[PDB]
Amino acid sequence: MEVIELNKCTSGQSFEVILKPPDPSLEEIQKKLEAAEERRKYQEAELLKHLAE
Amino acid sequence: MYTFVVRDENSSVYAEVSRLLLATGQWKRLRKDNPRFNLMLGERNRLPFGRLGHEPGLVQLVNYYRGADKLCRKASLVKLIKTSPELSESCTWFPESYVIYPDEREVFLAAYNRRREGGNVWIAKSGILISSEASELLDFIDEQVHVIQKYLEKPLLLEPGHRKFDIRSWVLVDHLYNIYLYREGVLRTSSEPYCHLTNHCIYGRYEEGNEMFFEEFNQYLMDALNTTLENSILLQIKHIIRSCLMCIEPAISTKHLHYQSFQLFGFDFMVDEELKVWLIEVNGAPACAQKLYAELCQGIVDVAISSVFPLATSIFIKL
Amino acid sequence: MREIVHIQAGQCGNQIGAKFWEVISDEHGIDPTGSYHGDSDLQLERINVYYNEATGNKYVPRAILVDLEPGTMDSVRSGPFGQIFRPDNFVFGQSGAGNNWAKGHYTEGAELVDSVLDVVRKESESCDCLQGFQLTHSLGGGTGSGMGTLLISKIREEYPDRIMNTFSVMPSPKVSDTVVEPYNATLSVHQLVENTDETYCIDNEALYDICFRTLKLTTPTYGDLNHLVSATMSGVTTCLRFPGQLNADLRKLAVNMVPFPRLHFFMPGFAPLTSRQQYRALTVPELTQQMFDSKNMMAACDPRHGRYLTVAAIFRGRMSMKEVDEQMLNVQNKNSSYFVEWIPNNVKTAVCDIPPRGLKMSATFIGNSTAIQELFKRISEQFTAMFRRKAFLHWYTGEGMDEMEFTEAESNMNDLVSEYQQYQDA
Amino acid sequence: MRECISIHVGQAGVQIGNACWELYCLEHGIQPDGQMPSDKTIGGGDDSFNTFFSETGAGKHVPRAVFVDLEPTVIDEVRTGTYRQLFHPEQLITGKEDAANNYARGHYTIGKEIIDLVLDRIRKLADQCTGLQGFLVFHSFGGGTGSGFTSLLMERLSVDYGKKSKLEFSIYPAPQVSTAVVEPYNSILTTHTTLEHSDCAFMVDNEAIYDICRRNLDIERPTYTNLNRLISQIVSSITASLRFDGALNVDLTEFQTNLVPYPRIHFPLATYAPVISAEKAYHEQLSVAEITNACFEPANQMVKCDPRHGKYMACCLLYRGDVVPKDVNAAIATIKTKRSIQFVDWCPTGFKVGINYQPPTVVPGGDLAKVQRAVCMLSNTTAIAEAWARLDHKFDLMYAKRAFVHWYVGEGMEEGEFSEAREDMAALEKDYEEVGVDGEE
Ligand SMILES: CC(=O)O[C@@]12CO[C@@H]1C[C@H](O)[C@@]1(C)C(=O)[C@H](O)C3=C(C)[C@@H](OC(=O)[C@H](O)[C@@H](NC(=O)CBr)c4ccccc4)C[C@@](O)([C@@H](OC(=O)c4ccccc4)[C@H]21)C3(C)C
Ligand SMILES: Nc1nc2c(ncn2[C@@H]2O[C@H](COP(=O)(O)OP(=O)(O)OP(=O)(O)O)[C@@H](O)[C@H]2O)c(=O)[nH]1
Ligand SMILES: Nc1nc2c(ncn2[C@@H]2O[C@H](COP(=O)(O)OP(=O)(O)O)[C@@H](O)[C@H]2O)c(=O)[nH]1
Ligand SMILES: [Ca+2]
Ligand SMILES: [Mg+2]
Ligand SMILES: [Mg+2]
Ligand SMILES: [Mg+2]
């Protein structure tokens, strides 16, 4: 057991004890959001088409 | 009413425990995947311990100790004894053993040669081969991890018959980690003159089914050797059971855990001609003798199950 | 501010709707003149869900009253709370619907439906954020059944992204006005399958049996049946009218109760129900046991003949919340056979501190059970008994309907029954 | 000095953020009106508490915080609460209708319409930073806003602040206080979308906080207020190193360096002790050894699981109060001989210890007793994968029947995202298993 990296200050201290060694771009996100919005508009159009019948 | 599920249809012990619970009128069996249970009689392999104790308003109990496999697998039992200071490599009741992978291959040869230079018969298991020299033992294993163990060349031989045997002890550990030894053991005796393997799978000459129980065996030790089963053997058996289970208790105990565990173990012992007891293996999912099924399974319900889920002379020895 | 627009259509819909508004006006401290006179701020915290605030701190129900004859709505306006409704929200004709779905849906109702939608549009335009609609109606008559489902179809067309909820009274031969009720109910059920998100199935057979066998009323009236409904309608909307965490709005309720879009027909229940002993204090174990008993549920279906997909339970009054959890998890773990294992934790529990006017404690049950198929089976059997001989069809063909539309309605409900049987075995 | 911005999303995130900033003000001596009589540099400064607080010329200390919710009732309580004067309206963003416990509604339908406004308000706080180091994101797994909108915001934050670190405080769903049946869906959906955008996430299982409140605080039916005051204590223990003078975990990147060797396995287990009821007149004050021993009791963990059957990759000890390094080492030596503490072979078997002398602050009138010393242990153990296993099992049960799926597809999401999210969780469970894992007889 050993204590290393002992740093002390007025509000406390810290140290280490060793016991044994051994992204999508903006356009890509915009496409996904608009693709889901298109699918919502398509389902709503089918609904209104169904209600018109 | 209490609820339980069955996840191992092949367990003769808990197939009897389940029908005992279904005979008290206070236990109902659910479908095997219904999570709203009080008691799980779980599967032998890959039991989902991580999904236990997360049902609000349910005290959940399981019939297996997570992590007890370290004691019930041959390779890990050797590693546990040689690395745990509670047992030490100087352990006197466990035969000299080595874990080798097809590694302690070099340490095994140094010990083997040092006594062949000065009898050294060993055994291989994990599919059993008993050879007299080391070159033949290593070739059979390369045909999974195995262990080479010193073979007991001088066993205690029953008379008449000049026959080998082994002792099976059943041990129940409840949720409070009380260690209960069933007062009834069985001797799986060989029917051939010394015949080297005494497993019940491998007849009926001197006793029915090659099974001698403690009453007859104790009577034999008094007539032939002028001693008792309690003094000559059972003190060592109780000592070995306590040593093994207390060693792994901090690793497997469920005292402050969100679910509780109990488990039935099968301890296999051997006795040499000097009446010294040796530990062979520990069994995590053991079967029982046909006569002792009713008494032991009822003891499991009384000690391990009803202690947590109460209903509306003990057969165990508390260690 | 998530406002709900209430609509009551036809004789049954308006008489039940009237009692509902009387009941929740008392709970929120609203007198028959629209003035608040309560003593708790919990009564006003979510009062905008059902009431508009007019000049002078008066509260006007966001309710629209619809009928094809004036009779029932005249009696409502002359009723106890009749003056609380906005007079413009009375939309009625004069010809009536003659217990005829075709008249309500295709001829007489079509002439009036645009006037109702004008009032609906006016109430919606004054909503900070309208969340949906609730319709009170019967399925056995002509106006509530035929025109009510016509209203739903046209409301969905104009507000496709809003929740549609109904309290639908199912007909029964034991409590029957005309023999064509199975025809009208079969035609309406298909509309509800397509165009509602939540439908509380209220069986007049169950209401009668509860009044007779439990409440010990020898000769129940329609007023006795409507008394049970208003108490149930108050219970199932407690989560919408008072502060709470669970099922707080119509869309969250639908997300928790409807695993499959077409299977959105709920069995309601109320506890306690006792004869007149009535002063005896009720305990939490007693509320829970009655709430889950079949004799307390109003769809006339045995839940032990099916399995629960989702369950909502609301407890009202001052009681031990710990004791509420215990008994709820007690009946749930003791009868886990009747809950589907493939929807974990499908029983949600809510507690409201404010009890009903006359009780210290009460409980309301909302179950989406596959046993509701027994209700649609009964209606299908009664429909087929007449349709196989084309009996009484001339009332409908005389309004322009064809026999094919009846055949399709028969098939749609048999399909609905089969869909429930699919998940009852799963 | 490098500033940190806190983001609170949904009811759970907002109500927890409210409890933290109340505790922060008590710890730093900041009054509800924003005044701080100990800050002698009026109108500016680069002190350690300035990482979480900006300053106005009038001397008001303003949290570097954004509150966002899709319905206004929860954030309205912040507008009228005790610390209402602390925030200006730009920090509080509300919609009119919520995500209805539907990930797809929070992520796609409503999220697309409010994400630009949220980023604009966040940019306003970022522009007031001389050296922004990243964000702390508070949200639930089960809510439609906390799951759906957070995973969208985390994607855009990686685009607009690619160099900045992101830490999460996430509320794991527990049926005892859960408000929705589809919370396993939303949890898996948001973990999949957020996994590559979060550098370190602290999960808190409501079931664990609930049971700690019942056992240790003697509260028969804990409320969100009870749970949030306990959560705010653990959160304060984790963020104290950024807000006070010290040398351990002094910036957000050190959290990843000290706790997360593998980028995907970034879910440290938190354990806190002691939790002591304020109703009892006298409590025996636990020692350094006793509170350090309690860090290895499953009953004190933020997620109930068994670290004995996993492997450690890292372990930090954060003490507050009367603690000297001599007693910590003596406690570690005693514990290591009696506990099952096994590390992976490629990591050192050791502990990084941080001590802050100021004892933990308790809210006046709260349920927590004032103690002389406390400790929070942050350990990266593979045992926390038990929480993923429970969650993925509930997912599998409902998804096999496609229960409730239509609600998500109806909002523009595809069924393939469900299985795509599930396969990622299957891979995540496999990564934990690779790192931490060694009849009728
Ligand atoms: C509902 C309810 O309690 O029903 C029973 C029946 O089983 C319950 C149990 C009771 O204890 C028992 C028996 C009462 O003895 C009680 O003295 C009493 C209450 C509390 C009265 O109900 C109230 O005042 C409530 O606050 C109430 N509002 C009204 O009902 C309007 Br009047 C309400 C309920 C739920 C939600 C919101 C508001 C009703 C009742 O007539 C009596 O029911 C009926 O005879 C009845 C007949 C036919 C159909 C339905 C009920 C009653 C009277 C007698 C006045
Ligand atoms: N610990 C804690 N958990 C909370 C709190 N509020 C909600 N939760 C949990 O969060 C989950 C519900 O998600 P919410 O945050 O309330 O929902 P939301 O993020 O607002 O999303 P929507 O309401 O659907 O728009 C449930 O599991 C709750 O138990 C809280 O104040 N404290
Ligand atoms: N529960 C209840 N059912 C009613 C009431 N009035 C009529 N019904 C039922 O509703 C059906 C008749 O529909 P009704 O509302 O009178 O026709 P409508 O006015 O044209 O919509 C029959 O099944 C009746 O049993 C009532 O006040 N209460
Ligand atoms: Ca300053
Ligand atoms: Mg009528
Ligand atoms: Mg919300
Ligand atoms: Mg064996």
Kindly list the domain boundaries of chain C, sorted by start residue. Answer: 3-265, 266-374, 375-425
CA distance C157 to chain A (A): 6
The SS3 call for residue C51 is strand
Contacts of A47 in chain C (CB under 8 A): 156, 160
Q: Report the nearest atom of ligand 2 relative to the CA of C252.
A: 24
Give me the catalytic one of D27, D155, D254, D417: D254
CB of C156 less than 8 A from some CB of D? no
Indicate the length of chain A as a whole number.
53
- What SS3 state is found at B135? helix
The Cα C171–Cα C181 span in angstroms is: 6
Any chains having at least 3 CB pairs less than 8 A from chain A are C, D
Residues C36, C42: Cα–Cα separation, whole Å:
12
Instruction: Using alpha carbons, select from C196, C89, C82, C78 the residue that is nearest to residue C137.
Output: C196
| Torsion (CA) C129, C131, C135, C136 in degrees, nearest 10 | -90
| Mutate which of C359, C364, C365 for ligand 1 pocket (most atoms within 8 A of beta carbon) | C359
Give all chains having 3 or more CB-to-CB distances under 8 Å with chain D: A, B, C
Query: The domain B69-71+156-318: what is its CATH number?
Result: 3.30.470.20
Tokens 């539309």 correspond to what residue?
C405
How far is it, in rounded angstroms, from Cα B177 to Cα B263? Answer: 10
Give the C-alpha separation, D188 to C346, whole Å: 18
Of B51, B283, B286, the CB nearest to D389: B51
Q: Determine the length of chain D.
A: 441
C-alpha distances (whole Å) from C183 to each of B53, B219, C75 are 53, 88, 28
How would you write C312-372 as a 3-class SS string? EEEEEECCCHHHHHHHHHHHHHHCHHHECCCCCCCEEEEEECCCCCCCCEEEEEEEEEHHH
* Phi, then psi, of C363 in degrees rounded to 5: -140, 140
B112 vs B89, B118, B233, B278, CA distance in Å?
16, 10, 29, 20
CA distances to A12, C135, D274, D363, D370 from D322, rounded to whole Å, are 10, 65, 13, 20, 13
Question: Using an 8 Å Cβ cutoff, are B75 and B147 in contact?
Answer: yes
**CB of residue C190 inside a 6 A radius of ligand 1:** no
Quick one: CA torsion of B249, B252, B256, B261, rounded to 10 degrees? -110
Instruction: Copy the structure tokens of residue D46.
Output: 């680069």
Phi-psi region of A5 (alpha: psi -120 to 50; beta: other; left: phi over 0): left
Instruction: For the sheet with C198-203, list strands across it.
Output: C90-92, C63-67, C4-9, C132-138, C163-170, C198-203, C265-271, C361-369, C308-317, C347-352
Please tell me if residue D156 touches chain B, with a CB cutoff of 8 Å.
Answer: no
Beta bridge mates, C170: C203
Collapse the DSSP code of C391 into the 3-class scheme (helix H, G, I; strand E, B; otherwise coil) and give the result. Answer: coil
Q: What are phi and psi of D249, to 5 degrees?
A: 50, 50
Element (H, E) at C125: helix C108-125
D325 in contact with C at a CB cutoff of 8 Å? Answer: no
Cis-peptide, bond into residue C272, ω within 30° of zero:
yes
| Residue that is written with structure tokens 């209490």 in the block | B2
The verdict on whether omega for the bond into residue D274 sits within 30 degrees of 0, i.e. cis, is yes
Look at the domain C375-425 and name its fold: Helix Hairpins (1.10.287)
Selected residue of D215, D393, D401 to mutate for chain C interface (largest C Cβ count, 10 A): D401
Nearest alpha-carbon partner for C134 in C294, C291, C244, C24:
C24
Residue B8 one-letter amino acid? D
Pick the CATH number of B2-68 from 3.40.50.12780, 3.40.50.300, 3.40.50.970, 3.40.50.11480: 3.40.50.11480
User: B5, B31 in Cβ contact below 8 A?
Assistant: yes
Burial D310-347, CB ≥16 within 10 A → b, else e: bbbbbbbbbbbbebebebbbebbeebeeebebbbbeeb
Q: What's the gap in Å between the CA of B40 and the closest CA on chain C?
A: 15
Name the nearest CA neighbour of D181 among D20, D401, D351: D401
Question: Of all atoms in ligand 1, which is nearest to the CA of residue C359?
Answer: 20
SS3 D418: helix
| Alpha-carbon span D286 to C380, nearest angstrom | 71
From the list D175, D309, D439, the residue facing B10 with the nearest CB is: D439
A1, A6, A39: residue with CB nearest D333: A1
Does C266-374 carry CATH code 3.30.1330.20?
A: yes
Residue pointed to by tokens 């350690």? D48
Q: Three-state DSSP class for D1? A: coil
Query: Which amino acid appears at position C24 of this protein?
Result: I
Three-state secondary structure readout of D274-289: CCCECCCCCCCCCCHH
Interface test with A, best of D113, D119, D353 (most A CBs within 10 A): D353
C356, HSE (Cβ side, Cα atoms, 13 Å): 22
- Please report the atom of ligand 1 found closest to the CA of residue C274: 7
Which residue's CA lies nearest to atom 34 of ligand 1? Answer: C231
SS3 at position B186: strand
The reply to whether D415 belongs to the active site is no
Question: What SS3 state is found at D246?
Answer: coil
Residue A49 neighbours by CB distance under 10 Å: 9
Ligand-binding annotation for D144, yes or no, is yes
- Give the number of A-D residue pairs with CB atoms closer than 8 Å: 107
| Technique used | X-ray
Burial class (CB in 10 A: 0-12, 13-18, 19+), B111: middle
Tell me how close the Cα of A51 comes to any Cα of chain C, in angstroms. Answer: 7
Q: Degrees (nearest 5) of the Cα angle D271, D245, D321?
A: 45
Please check if D51 is assigned to a binding site: no
Sign of the Cα torsion D127, D128, D131, D137 reads negative
Query: In chain C, which residue's Cα lies nearest the Cα of B54?
Result: C345
d(CA C304, CA B41): 28
Q: In this structure, which residue's CA is closest to atom 21 in ligand 1?
A: C358
Cα B123 to Cα B152: distance, rounded to the nearest angstrom: 9
Helices (H), chain B: 12-21, 69-72, 74-83, 105-117, 134-141, 214-225, 229, 235-252, 293-300
Q: Please give the single-letter amino acid code of residue B21.
A: L
Query: Is the distance from the beta carbon of residue D356 to the nearest atom of ligand 2 less than 6 Å?
Result: no
Beta-bridge partners for C351: C315
**Chain A, nearest residue to D104 by Cα:** A36
Residue C171 CA, closest ligand 3 atom number: 23
What is the whole-number distance in angstroms between the Cα of residue C9 and the centre of ligand 1? 25
Ligand 2 within 6 A of CB of D301: no
The C-alpha of A52 sits at a distance from chain D's nearest C-alpha, in angstroms, of 20
**Ligand 2 proximity of D342 Cβ (cutoff 6 Å):** no
Protein residue whose Cα sits closest to atom 17 of ligand 3: C141
Q: Select the residue from B2, B36, B58, B59 to test the C interface by mutation, using most C Cβ atoms within 10 A.
A: B36
The answer to whether the CB of D143 is under 6 A from ligand 2 is yes
Which domains does chain D possess? 3-269 (3.40.50.1440), 270-386 (3.30.1330.20)
Using a CB–CB cutoff of 8 Å, tell me whether D46 touches chain B.
no
Record: fold of C3-265: Rossmann fold (3.40.50)
Q: So where are chain B's domains?
A: 2-68, 69-71+156-318
